[PDB]
Symmetry: D2
């Protein structure tokens, strides 16, 4: 009767505004929570074609999808059926700043995601507005508790055309809806996110992520 099933569906609606450009994006996917793997088909419903690199949105498209070993507390699987929410800031090295929120609920075998994304101050000659990005590099999220709230800090980098990189700092706070969800100790979550396929304007994107929790060296 556990709330997390081996094979679950993801329903998602994101609405947002980057540099004044409004958009709405729907997502429909599937995933294996215990293997930390998920995939989603995304469709721009409003605001297509997007004038900014689709990659800035992709980590906003659920830490339920992370394989947690036994010795690390799994805050996110413990947050269901009721669910949890997160808030995030993305601080890019050229001054562009985004904030995002996701309210996550569950019914039967399906997670529901109410997503908001806002970005300001991206320069017109920067790699985001020039759509010069190729992918997020693999990353490692550092998970710790601060003021009673599980917090994830990430040194991220977008690979650009030309083999340069473009740095972004992520800070996420995760909050279970129900009281009594046990907070975890310090730990790390490896991430790899990839756009598997897209049409020319990125009005249709298939996205994939793999995530694994561990305790660092030497144990993991």
């Amino acid at each position: 009767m556990s709330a997390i099933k081996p094979d679950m569906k993801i329903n998602l609606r994101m609405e947002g505004n980057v540099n004044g450009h409004h958009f709405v994006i729907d997502g429909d996917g599937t995933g294996k929570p215990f293997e930390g793997k998920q995939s989603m088909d995304l469709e721009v419903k409003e605001g297509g074609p997007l004038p900014f690199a689709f990659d800035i949105l992709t980590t906003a498209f659920n830490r339920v999808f992370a394989e947690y070993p036994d010795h690390i507390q799994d805050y996110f699987k413990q947050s269901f059926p009721k669910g949890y929410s997160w808030e995030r800031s993305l601080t890019f090295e050229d001054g562009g700043i985004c904030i995002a929120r996701n309210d996550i609920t569950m019914e039967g075998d399906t997670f529901y995601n109410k997503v908001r994304f806002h970005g300001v101050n991206f320069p017109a000659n920067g790699p985001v507005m020039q759509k010069k990005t190729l992918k997020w590099e693999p990353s490692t999220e550092k998970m710790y508790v601060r003021d009673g709230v599980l917090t994830g800090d990430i040194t991220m980098a977008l690979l650009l055309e030309g083999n340069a990189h473009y740095r972004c700092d992520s800070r996420t706070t995760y909050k279970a809806k129900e009281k009594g969800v046990k907070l975890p100790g310090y730990h790390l979550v490896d991430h790899c996110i990839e756009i598997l396929s897209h049409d020319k304007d990125y009005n249709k994107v298939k996205l994939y992520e793999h995530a694994v929790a561990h305790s660092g060296l030497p144990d993991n």
Copy 2:
């Protein structure tokens, strides 16, 4: 060049929608101002989301650099942006991790500015001065104005005074963009600010706000 259509006495009309730490709110504003004196006041009314669960002070600079006294030797991007108007986007990075972004579309009709304002903030700690409403006021500040990536940009070291005389630092970056073509870009300059909540009811559902701003070139001709 360009003539302004800015008048010595103008009206201000403002609607803000936003969301801080997940709480939705809508706030309306109606005020007057003296553009060439750089002074303005506004009556604010929380329409949705009252009583606000966070310190009202974090919103107040989102509540127009038209209201800044510019001397003749510094180009005035803002008065030269009308009648068509301009927009700005802003990040507020607080020292305890709280981050806000805001934007304002400013138009003009007759003697009235219209402001379409959006405000979103995340990651404010539950026991911090913002969610505990321990702020007292913004200290007077100086905005540093310069052209970055072809765009007029204002960077400000800001500080909220807290109860128990302590300060809570916030870093501000704003980009300003005229709607019309051909607006001349200024050289580097400073804008002194002082913003004040003159009065408010107990829950800050109603707030009277005041700002005074003066542009200058720094020492010694300050």
Copy 3:
């Protein structure tokens, strides 16, 4: 207060040693100044490591807030710190990753201030404005003075003017500590600064530097 053994005209003696991007240097300075006017000037000479391979400008704020005009309504922590003296520590964080720290231990014998200065910088990119010497000057600035955990702290939004009238941003954080126990701390206030190189030889082995600084309470006051 006015019980100062600070005189209206003071000599300034300085030795800086440092290392930027692996390059060692020693620089001596001899100047004079008017503490109550907030003005000072200095002749600087590179004794070792000349000609410097980085922009001289990054060094110049390390070349004493005694030379700041304080009005009577603001507590003057720096003039009150003498005759014993005070020390400061500083970080300079540049927008392209270059970071500097600096310290100065300031003493006084007779009519002369003595300055033991150290300056270390790391992580300047090979083709950035510092290592390529594209800086023209510091822009005028305003330092924001406040108390944090018992120590007077000054935060500054600084900008180096570059070739082509672009700007290169640096964030300054300084902590100031009187040697004597019990020197009274000021409330929040603002110090305008304008630092300028008045002349130099081609390689900047010899530089004449000037600074004007004035404390104030911001608008609508000063």
Copy 4:
């Protein structure tokens, strides 16, 4: 085609100044470069007992000692016998900022390390001046090239007494002495550093580190 041996000696000399406190610390250790392991006995020679937390110094006490797999360029082992140097900034969340430098050379089977360390603006009641730190948590360094120089950024955290964490951002730049050493692609270096033993005043410290380079998920 070697230069670097499976077992190598380490000689270190650090001079520095934190909060105005001058200090000199000597190091003598051994390590296995191809296994990414090293141990060092440290001894304060001037400025002891230190008035600040010893932990802030320990990552300044050589990425030679990192296990690099065959599919990733090993910039550090390729830098010898000539050597290389690094510069680092540490930015703590409460305003304390450190810079450090190390000039690494090699004479026979021994590495030599000329280390400098300077720290400023640590609050008198912060965990560093109050010596309230317990250890660095395991970390992951993100390694990428920027303006021709191999750069590593780290989200780091000190565990404190009282079940709390104290966050520090590290940026290091690494420069081979010899011209033309091949730069690597983007990659990640897991770290775990540990004070194994120490006397009461931390005037003698036994330090240990384990480091392993990898390409992130799923390649690890």
